[PDB]
Design a protein around this ligand. Structure first.
Ligand SMILES: CC(=O)N[C@H]1[C@H]([C@H](O)[C@H](O)CO)O[C@@](OC[C@H]2O[C@@H](O)[C@H](O)[C@@H](O)[C@H]2O)(C(=O)O)C[C@@H]1O
Ligand SMILES: CC(=O)N[C@H]1[C@H]([C@H](O)[C@H](O)CO)O[C@@](OC[C@H]2O[C@@H](O)[C@H](O)[C@@H](O)[C@H]2O)(C(=O)O)C[C@@H]1O
Ligand SMILES: CC(=O)N[C@H]1[C@H]([C@H](O)[C@H](O)CO)O[C@@](OC[C@H]2O[C@@H](O)[C@H](O)[C@@H](O)[C@H]2O)(C(=O)O)C[C@@H]1O
Ligand SMILES: *[C@@H]1O[C@H](CO)[C@@H](O)[C@H](O)[C@H]1NC(C)=O
Ligand SMILES: *[C@@H]1O[C@H](CO)[C@@H](O)[C@H](O)[C@H]1NC(C)=O
Ligand SMILES: *[C@@H]1O[C@H](CO)[C@@H](O)[C@H](O)[C@H]1NC(C)=O
Lengths: 164, 321, 321, 164, 164, 321
């Protein structure tokens, strides 16, 4: 992972999160559960969707082959014709395959990037009030009820609240 | 004690994608963008049926090979299907001038209306019902191309022919005619009396003078003689003029080009299947929303883009384990 | 209390660029690399003016259609402009052999020097001033192509012509000649006496023997007769030999190829505009430092690279909000 | 933002910085002001400039179309000719558009990358002597005059100087 | 460096490490030495090797030119033929050069990425028990013998062991 | 006090790679993927030697120019090498019909077996040993193309020739023949008696009738006369029929096409070098494991992919300083 999040410091994925690609798992007095960060999940959807549509629209005016015929004494132009359509066919096959290979790599690193940025969003809010365990989890130095958790999820965490 | 974790989605998907640095990567979501399926049939294209030449070639069709009577009158078509090697072609051995250029015109034509420009009955001073050969048999009997008439001498006389036809139609006319190349001087006189013959043809654009070529040739379909056919597009209000004192294979039926459009001559051994599609290939039809396909390059209708790949899948989700 | 911040540039720029994942992204700096502007005029190319065939074709020019006298003597040119359908072409109906191959040669030629290889006065035993037609009118009167001379019989006699021309110049010679295809045997004798005629032509490389084709044809520009023109490049120190006993349209003026180079036959309805450029398209000239343009594929001079895009902008700065 | 800086933990850009793309804003006793980090700004200029010139020079030998003509009985080669020039025209239009789309994305992430690297350059010097606010700012635990600030800007910060 | 490691916060490379691309240098009572992290080094090898083979296999069906001849009155098709082979030759020369330029950039940033991820792997294990110097080194707050060092190298560092 | 550091490899390598944003970047490891070296020789291709036409053209070879006797019998070959301008070609001036289409066939042929289909001795009523010219000299003496025989009159008589040859071989036959174009009517009778002559040729597929063209031409190799050669592929079990009453250059030796395959006509001034390779270019051979090369586009054998680049290096290691 280019950004070191997915399969990096965060060992695995969550089978339990079904509402989105990236999100949170919390553990307090009121209970436990998974929650998807809609903002970063939607931004990922809007990205990959555009990427697919852009790959498609760039290859909508490709090169269609037509049929031509040549007699026994036009072998040169017949051959020229054949190599030419095989020619365009090869470069457009190269294009599609290469583009897919390249953007697939980008897509996976895109998701990897999103996960780390989400991690840093929570990390930069908590600061002292919790400690990095090292697996994508922060252990709190105070009590964080659902209201406190949601404040973290929507980037409105009120840091002024002690430790030790 | 309370804690919060950041994580990512994972599921039970074994869908794989490839990258530049690693192949067969398992992801949570993937979109396949390649169609690899056809129905194995030749279908109509948006309601309009293709003209399926079965065991006949374009030549047999247009010249009217007796083995090709299925195509004497042909409705409007979407595309044409012809086999790799049609068995019914030039029943009488010979050649077709600019055959490929003509087949190329057929790619921009959708409908032919067969009309009689010079009736066989109109030949008074020549024999018009003896121009037959065992090389073009119909039901056992010696016959000939149906759209052209092989004229010979009458009462040991072949008067020089002067025939005109004006195209009073609003559509272009595909006009076909031919010359007979005998195999010796005895055959020339026995058929046309005159030992030295010609065929002159003129439009506003055409100016050709044909002469027969005597030559000893190997037998093809039992005949050493040869038929050489020529064609022209007659513009509306233009006229075609024939002059000849022998060896003339005159037109009787010509073709009104009443429908121009997007067509194709498709090569396939397949026959018609009672079906309909928006995209047709020589080996079957495609019904797909896919942007790509790998079935056949030669395509007609609203089709995906052909690619030589056997696999094309786009990652949409993320890694999975 | 003291503090320090790290940040990035931002401004009042609404310039947008596109990415694979997001379109219309506002940036602080962007470079447009696509030229979308021309001046709508046909200009000189680096000082040297184009030859603008107005209502004439290459054929009318080279054969000397009386309607094309503007181009009797033509200075060196950069490129050629011809219309989609020049009205002044073959005034006398007929054809031009290898017309497209000739126009292709014109793309590598910049200057023609017209010279008289066989003077009209030099015909003693033939009529050289009666070869005119109401199909090539000049100022009302029947005239003819100016660079070739339509010879006929004199005192009911057409002696067989044996004419040679040696190319003592150091440049290749474009030589043009033709044959007349009458419409009947009465016209053949009335013009050339001899009922059976030919035209033989020989160089070190050419060996052709032309014969006239009698044919009944529809009238074009009032004439059913036809003129068929031929051409050859005469190498320096080579000679061209003509023999004929009728139907010969002899050369009088030929073309010295004194300037080879990079030219083009441009298709356009536009006329000359008193301007200058380094890059010319059929619809106007380009004055740009841009690497790309989307005006027209057919280009000449030092031009940007043509692309089908309507927008091409490169991000140089960063995101802005 | 792939690197999470621009429009990430740093909310917006500075209208006030005109000397460069990336830089610093300081706040001490002597006053306040903006300053551009010439090194990272120049490196960005040298990068994007090369990128533009490389995109241009890779498409300088493209495919120019010439004019050919064909008579009424050479429709096959005429069509072959037409599809062939339309062919090359399409692949070169694909190339230019795709290259622009791909490198534009790289360019924006390049700038995003530069901002975070600059942030980490200051962050790795200060360490204890200041605290990360979370918006690209560090609040000092000592007094940093213009001389101290410039030391930070040119990577010669003398960490040996206390806290609390 | 897109990830800010190589030539970033880590000033230079190690001439002394010959067993791999990325690794560790340790300094304790028992001695000093270099060691290559085989896991991240192998993963880099497996990546770049695939990349080279993929670049090669995408251009194995390119466009070979054949020889055709044309007489003095077939200049149009001769020219068509020439422009067509020059055509395919140009787009395939563009492809190879561009692909090399693009993937070379990726490769260097790939290595840069690997170095930072390796750094963060050690950083996320040590936490309190050592301090970031700022040059890729951590100064321990305890004694780390070869056994302790190897625990860090193989991601099995037992954090429960004090400080101050 | 104890400490641990994370770092990366570095060495004494000055190998450089290029990126989009920066050129000449020094790396620790780099793989060059471009072959820029050849051996400057024309070699065998996997054991099988090329047919190296030295100062002869395909025409001189096939027609049997006396200056080309080195190639009278030719073993199987891999590829053909011909110079830009072979000096030994048509010793007697004239032309070769469909020359380029024939050379294109040679690209799919690897072996010719020369056989005598009509022996020179078999001409009884014609002169078959006087068909020579100072335009085709052999060792000073006037000679002629060796595979075809220039027949003339015998005892002031040229009886009409009727000759057939059946292809009883299992391979296709390359058959060559020609016509002589005299320079006047006196030469026509002096050589063939009959003032009006023809050559008819027929197979199951061919039907041509040639007539000689009298014409005054400039001297080439001392002759104003012309020889025009024609060819055909004779299918197994098909026959070729000749009829002529003059000006016939009959075949004596024809070519059995016994080996079809992947060949090429390579243009080069280089001669044979006693060497072997798996990849051959016009300027030398390649022995490489490289995927790319920049030597020459026209290639044969198992070769790298040709590219116009002068440098192609892939980064494998990392930055170095
Ligand atoms: C219109 C006509 O005459 N049809 C003839 C045809 C022509 O004579 C011939 O094809 C012209 O090229 O000949 C056919 O066979 C004739 C056949 O008869 C043998 O007995 C004779 O020995 C042969 O030489 C040969 O002529 C034919 O069916 O095509 C007969 C046909 O009636
Ligand atoms: C050199 C010459 O004879 N010019 C004639 C020309 C030729 O006869 C003709 O073009 C040859 O193909 O004919 C022109 O019109 C002749 C016209 O005269 C009618 O009266 C007659 O009934 C028609 O048959 C027809 O021949 C012409 O102007 O081109 C006259 C010209 O003088
Ligand atoms: C078979 C034969 O007749 N070979 C002749 C050849 C032919 O006559 C000629 O090439 C046919 O086109 O002519 C050669 O030169 C003849 C030469 O003789 C001069 O004296 C005369 O004045 C010239 O007109 C010319 O005919 C030749 O060598 O090719 C002689 C050869 O024997
Ligand atoms: C065909 O006939 C019409 C009148 O019926 C006429 O206008 C036209 O000129 C004729 N065409 C020719 C070429 O004679
Ligand atoms: C043309 O004339 C010159 C001498 O004036 C001569 O050298 C040359 O052979 C002549 N060309 C021909 C083909 O007769
Ligand atoms: C050639 O001869 C064989 C018999 O020897 C025969 O089958 C074949 O028809 C002949 N070919 C021709 C065209 O006469």
């Amino acid at each position: 992972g280019l950004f070191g999040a997915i399969a990096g410091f965060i060992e695995g994925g969550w089978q339990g999160m079904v509402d989105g690609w990236y999100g949170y798992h919390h553990s307090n007095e009121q209970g436990s559960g998974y929650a998807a960060d809609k903002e970063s999940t939607q931004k990922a959807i809007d990205g990959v969707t555009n990427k697919v549509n852009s790959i498609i629209d760039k290859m909508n005016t490709q090169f269609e082959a037509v049929g031509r015929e040549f007699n026994n004494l036009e072998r040169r132009i017949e051959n020229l014709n054949k190599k030419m359509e095989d020619g365009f066919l090869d470069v457009w096959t190269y294009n599609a395959e290469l583009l897919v290979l390249m953007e697939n790599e980008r897509t996976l690193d895109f998701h990897d990037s999103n996960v780390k940025n989400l991690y840093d969003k929570v990390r930069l809010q908590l600061r002292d009030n919790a400690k990095e365990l090292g697996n994508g989890c922060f252990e709190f130095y105070h009590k964080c009820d659902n209201e406190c958790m949601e404040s973290i999820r929507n980037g409105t965490y009120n840091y002024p609240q002690y430790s030790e | 004690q309370d804690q919060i974790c950041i994580g990512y989605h994972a599921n039970n998907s074994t869908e794989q994608v490839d990258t530049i640095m690693e192949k067969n990567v398992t992801v949570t979501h993937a979109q396949d963008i390649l169609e690899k399926t056809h129905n194995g049939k030749l279908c109509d294209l948006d309601g309009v049926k293709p003209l399926i030449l079965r065991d006949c070639s374009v030549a047999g069709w247009l010249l009217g090979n007796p083995m090709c009577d299925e195509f004497i009158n042909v409705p409007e078509w979407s595309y044409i299907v012809e086999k790799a090697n049609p068995t019914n072609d030039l029943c009488y051995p010979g050649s077709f001038n600019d055959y490929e250029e003509l087949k190329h015109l057929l790619s921009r034509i959708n409908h032919f209306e067969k009309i009689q420009i010079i009736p066989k009955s109109s030949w008074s001073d020549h024999e018009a019902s003896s121009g037959v050969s065992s090389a073009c048999p119909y039901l056992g009997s010696p016959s000939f191309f149906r759209n052209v008439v092989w004229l010979i001498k009458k009462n040991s006389t072949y008067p020089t022919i002067k025939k005109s036809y004006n195209n009073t139609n609003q559509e272009d006319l595909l006009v076909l005619w031919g010359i007979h190349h005998p195999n010796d001087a005895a055959e020339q006189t026995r058929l046309y009396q005159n030992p030295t013959t010609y065929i002159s043809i003129g439009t506003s654009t055409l100016n050709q003078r044909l002469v027969p070529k005597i030559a000893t040739r190997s037998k093809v379909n039992g005949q050493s003689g040869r038929m050489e056919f020529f064609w022209t597009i007659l513009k509306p209000n233009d006229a075609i003029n024939f002059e000849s004192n022998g060896n003339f294979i005159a037109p009787e039926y010509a073709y009104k080009i009443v429908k121009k459009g997007d067509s194709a001559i498709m090569k396939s051994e397949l026959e018609y299947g009672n079906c309909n599609t928006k995209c047709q290939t020589p080996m079957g039809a495609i019904n797909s929303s896919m942007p790509f396909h790998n079935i056949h390059p030669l395509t007609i209708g609203e089709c995906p883009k052909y690619v030589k790949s056997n696999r094309l899948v786009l990652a949409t989700g993320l890694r999975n384990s």
